[PDB]
Design a protein around this ligand. Structure first.
Ligand SMILES: CC(=O)N[C@@H]1[C@@H](O)[C@@H](O)[C@@H](CO)O[C@@H]1O
Ligand SMILES: CC(=O)N[C@@H]1[C@@H](O)[C@@H](O)[C@@H](CO)O[C@@H]1O
Ligand SMILES: CC(=O)N[C@@H]1[C@@H](O)[C@@H](O)[C@@H](CO)O[C@@H]1O
Ligand SMILES: CC(=O)N[C@@H]1[C@@H](O)[C@@H](O)[C@@H](CO)O[C@@H]1O
Ligand SMILES: CC(=O)N[C@@H]1[C@@H](O)[C@H](O)[C@@H](CO)O[C@@H]1O
Ligand SMILES: CC(=O)N[C@@H]1[C@@H](O)[C@H](O)[C@@H](CO)O[C@@H]1O
Ligand SMILES: CC(=O)N[C@@H]1[C@@H](O)[C@H](O)[C@@H](CO)O[C@@H]1O
Ligand SMILES: CC(=O)N[C@@H]1[C@@H](O)[C@H](O)[C@@H](CO)O[C@@H]1O
Lengths: 142, 142, 142, 142
C-alpha cells in the first residue's frame, strides 16, 4: 500500500480563503480512501498506479484541483486552475488515465509542481518526503 | 440553486464506526460543492439535475456510498453497500446517469430509502425537509 | 503519556443532532491536547492525573459535557447535562479538581457512565479498552 | 449576540504546520460556542463581555494561543506564544479577567495584534470586519 499525506498552507488573505469541496479516488490499484488527522489529509491507496483529487473553492469563488498519486512506484502531482463550476473533481480525476488530456502530468512523476491561475493565485505542491510508501507533501496557496 | 444538508447518525457500535473517505459531485446543472458546518454536510448544486456521493468506511472495513441529488425539481437518494475497494465514489456517482445501472434509483425520486448490507449493517437516508430548494435529510447507520 | 480516543454515536434523530462547541484540557500531568482523526477524537495527556472535556450542543439547543481522563493510572469519565449557556466547559472541567463539586466522580475511576438529561436525552460513555496507556471509549447519545 | 469568524492562514512550512488542540469559551455574557464551517472557525457569544481561546500546536511541538472576544461592544484579541505543555487554553483564557496578568490586553480592544515567538514564529490577528455584531478576522502564522 501507498499513502500520501498533505499539509495545506494558505499564504495570502488577498487571494481569498480556500476550503475543500470535493475529494475523489481513482479505481486502479484496488482504489483508496481519503482521511483527515491533525488538520492534514491523507490519501491511502491499495498499491502503485492510482491517485486522488482534492477540489478547493475560495470564498472569492475560485475553483482549483490538486491531484496526487503514485505512478510506477514514484509519486506524482498536478494542479489545475481556472475551473468552471461544471468541471468537478469527478470530471478531472479520470482525465489522468485512459489516454486522457492530463495523463502527461502523471507521467512526469513530479515531486514538485507550481502554477499561477489566470486570475493571479499561485499554487504549489511540494513533496517533502519523495521516496517510499509513506509520502508527504505541502500544498501551498498564494 | 439547490442544497441538500445531511446529518449523520450512527446507532450501533457493534457495526463499527464509519467515517467519510470520499465526496464527489456530478457535472450536470453547473456542478456543485460539498461543505461542512456544525458537524453536518451540505451539497450545494447549480440547479436541478445533478447529485453527489459520500463514501464511508467503517473501522471494520465496510464500504458504503450515500447518493443524494435533485431530479426534475424533486429530491432523490440511494445507498449502495457491500462495495469492493476499487468501487470508489468516482465510479459510483456517474452510474446514476447516461443510462447507467443506478439511474433507476434517481428516477424514483425517493424522500426515504433504507437497505441492509449483506454483512448486516442497516443504512437509511430520510429527508426531513422534502420540498423546496433547501433540502434536509438524516443519514442513519445501524 | 496516556491517550483516550472517543467515537461518537448518535442514535436518535428526535433528540436533535449534537456537535462539539468546546474542548478543554486540564493543566495537571503536563497538560495535553485534543486531536481529530478519521472522525474520532483523541485526548493525549503528558501522564496520569489530568483530563479534558468536550462540550456538545444539539441543534435543538441542549448543552451537555463529556469528561474523560486518567486518575492514578485508571481511566475516569462523567457526563453533565442540563447545562446553562454560561456553564461552559471552561467552568466545568476545573470542578473535577480542588474540592470542586464534581471531584467525587473523578475519584470513582469509572470505565462506564450513563445518565439521562431532564429534557430526556440519554448519554453514555463506555470504555472499550479499559487498561493501559492507549484507552478507547464510545460516547453514545440516545 | 456577537460572533467572531476566523480564517487561519499559514504562510511558512518551515515553521511547521499548526493544528487546533483546544477551544475554550469564557463564562460571561451568557457564554458562547465554537463552530466550524467551510474551514473557518466561529465563536458565537450571548452578548458583549466574553471571549474564547484557540490553542494551536505545530507538528514541531510549538504551542501558542489566540484569544478573541468583545469587551464593552468592541472586539479584542491577543496572542500568547512560548507556552509550556501545562499552560493549556483552560489556564490562559481566565487570565484575561479578574486581575489576571493578561487583563490589560482585553482592555485595549485591539482590531489587530502581532507578535513573534522566541523560537521565531510570527503570529498576527487582523480583524477584516471591525464593527458590528458579526466580526471577522484573519489569523496568520508566519
Ligand atoms: C504499477 C503501476 O503503477 N502501474 C500503473 C497502472 O496501475 C496504471 O495506473 C497505468 C496507467 O497508465 O500506469 C501504470 O502502469
Ligand atoms: C431539470 C432537471 O432536473 N433535468 C435533469 C437533467 O439535468 C439530467 O440530470 C437528466 C438525466 O436523465 O435528468 C433531468 O432531465
Ligand atoms: C498519578 C496521578 O494520577 N496523579 C494525580 C495528580 O496528577 C492530580 O490529578 C491529583 C489531583 O488531586 O490527583 C492524582 O494524584
Ligand atoms: C458589556 C460588556 O462587555 N461587559 C463586560 C462584562 O461582561 C465583563 O466581561 C466585564 C469583566 O471585567 O467587562 C465588561 O464590563
Ligand atoms: C493554468 C493551469 O491551471 N494550467 C493547468 C496545468 O497546471 C495542468 O498541469 C494542466 C494539466 O492538467 O492543465 C492546465 O494546463
Ligand atoms: C444491498 C445493496 O447495497 N443494494 C444496492 C441498492 O441499495 C441500490 O439501490 C442499488 C442501486 O444503486 O445497488 C444495490 O442493489
Ligand atoms: C442529570 C445530570 O446530568 N446529572 C449529572 C451527573 O451525571 C454528574 O455525575 C454529576 C457530577 O458531575 O452532576 C450532574 O448533576
Ligand atoms: C512573546 C509573547 O508571546 N508575548 C506575549 C504577548 O503577545 C501577550 O500580549 C502577553 C499578554 O498575554 O503575554 C505574552 O508574553
Amino acid at each position: 500500500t501507498y499513502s500520501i499525506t498533505l499539509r495545506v498552507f494558505q499564504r495570502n488573505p488577498g487571494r481569498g480563503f480556500f476550503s475543500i469541496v470535493e475529494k475523489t479516488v481513482f479505481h486502479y490499484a484496488n482504489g483508496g480512501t481519503w482521511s483527515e488527522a491533525k488538520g492534514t489529509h491523507t490519501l491511502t491507496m491499495g498499491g502503485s498506479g492510482t491517485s486522488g483529487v482534492l477540489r478547493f473553492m475560495s470564498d472569492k469563488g475560485e475553483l482549483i484541483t490538486v491531484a496526487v498519486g503514485v505512478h510506477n512506484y514514484k509519486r506524482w502531482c498536478d494542479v489545475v486552475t481556472g475551473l468552471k463550476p461544471e468541471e468537478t473533481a469527478l470530471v478531472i480525476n479520470p482525465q489522468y488515465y485512459n489516454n486522457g488530456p492530463r495523463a502527461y502530468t502523471r507521467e512526469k512523476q513530479l515531486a514538485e509542481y507550481n502554477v499561477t491561475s489566470v486570475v493571479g493565485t499561485r499554487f504549489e505542491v511540494k513533496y517533502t518526503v519523495v521516496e517510499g510508501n509513506n509520502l508527504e507533501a505541502n500544498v501551498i496557496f498564494s
